[PDB]
C-alpha cells in the first residue's frame, strides 16, 4: 500500500536497515541514491519524495528528519557537485537534532 514518509515511518526504517547491515560505510553515487529511493517503494511502498540532503559542502545532512543516515566525505557523471567523496553512516543524533535546519536553515522554502 502506498504512503508518504512519516516520522515513525522513516524512524523505524532507519534501524531496520542498520539491523540488516546496510549502508554503513557504503560509497555514494547519484545513481545509488535512486537505487535506495526505489527499495523503499518496491519493498515498503514509501513515496520517495522524502530522500533529500543539504548541498554542503562538508558533511551532507538529510532534509527529512527522523532519517538516521548522514553523508560523510573521506570521475563520473553521478559524481559529486562539490568534488568530494561521500559514504553513508548511521547517527541517532539526527533523531533528536535537526542538523539540517541547525546548520543550513537557509535551504527551506
Amino acid at each position: 500500500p502506498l504512503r508518504t514518509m512519516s516520522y515513525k515511518l522513516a524512524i523505524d526504517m532507519s534501524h531496520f536497515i542498520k539491523e540488516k547491515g546496510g549502508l554503513e560505510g557504503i560509497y555514494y553515487s547519484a545513481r545509488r541514491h535512486r537505487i535506495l529511493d526505489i527499495y523503499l517503494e518496491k519493498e515498503e511502498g514509501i513515496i520517495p519524495d522524502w530522500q533529500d540532503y543539504t548541498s554542503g559542502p562538508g558533511i551532507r545532512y538529510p532534509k527529512t528528519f527522523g532519517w538516521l543516515w548522514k553523508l560523510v566525505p573521506v570521475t563520473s557523471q553521478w559524481d559529486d557537485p562539490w568534488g568530494e567523496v561521500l559514504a553513508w553512516k548511521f547517527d541517532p543524533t539526527l533523531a533528536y537534532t535537526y542538523e539540517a535546519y541547525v546548520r543550513y536553515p537557509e535551504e527551506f522554502g
Binding site: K20, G21, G22, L23, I26, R32, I35, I38, Y39
Partner: peptide, 16 residues
C-alpha cells in the same frame, strides 16, 4: 529480469 535486475542493485547496498 524485473525482480533480478532489482535485486542485483540492492546488492550494491548490502541487501537482497
Amino acid at each position: 529480469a524485473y525482480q533480478q535486475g532489482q535485486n542485483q542493485l540492492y546488492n550494491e547496498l548490502n541487501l537482497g
